[PDB]
């Protein structure tokens with residue numbers, strides 16, 4: 001009985017440029033499936049026109065993965081001269097008890113490393129400073145370095161928030177409601193990698209593997225320029 005996100009033309013283009021993964025990395029719905037009215041408990045359109053992702057379990061996901069309209073997977077040069085831009089209007093609800101971190105946007109390499117995760121976190125400690133209930137940027141220091149650089153972007157609000165990721169020429173910037181919160185972070189450690197965007201709900205390290213992470217997107221698009 002779930003309404004499909006494809007019924008809203010504001011999502012037609014990104015869905016044509018996406019495939020849906022759930023509850024792990026396996027695709028459950030390709031672009032043509034998504035455009036043909038795909039809907040389920042973990043991926044549906046709310047009555048007020050949010051595309052809502054929901055998932056439970058450790059490291060489980062309901063996530064769109066960037067695709068080309070050709071059906072090729074997106075695999076752009078992570079540090080190339082072409083600008084790649086993802087924009088999303090996201091409402092992060094108060095998360096259920098036991099939900100501790102939810103990744104909502106990513107730049108992922110074509111193998112096994114997230115270049116960037118934007119995530120909500122219950123708590124984070126960065127160089128001795130503890131922040132509670134914030135939205136975080138995490139940039140991995142390398143493919144062979146499991147550590148990452150972390151930057152608080154925003155105090156969590158239930159309000160619809162505009163996020164923009166701009167990647168170009170080995171730098172990455174993030175704006176939140178129009179304000180730069182990460183200014184040209186270096187990602188040269190992904191020279192020679194290819195990359196793609198992801199958006200949705202990716203549940204990291206829950207303390208209740210039964211609780212549902214839930215994320216709502218009012219707008220979502222990804223583009224490039226030359």
Ligand SMILES: *[C@@]1(O[C@H]2[C@H](O)[C@H](O)[C@H](O)O[C@@H]2C(=O)O)O[C@H](C(=O)O)[C@@H](O[C@@H]2O[C@H](C(=O)O)[C@@H](O)[C@H](O)[C@@H]2O)[C@H](O)[C@@H]1O
Pocket residue numbers: 059114125138140146147148149150204205
């Ligand atoms: C890292 O995030 C991982 C996510 O949780 C998902 O599993 C994703 O699929 O892969 C991400 C990744 O590998 O980058 O998780 C590790 C971790 O949990 O061990 C983080 O490494 C720790 O980070 C903290 C910190 O920087 O605050 C350190 O205190 C700790 O010693 C580890 O370095 C990593 O930063 C990243 O979040």
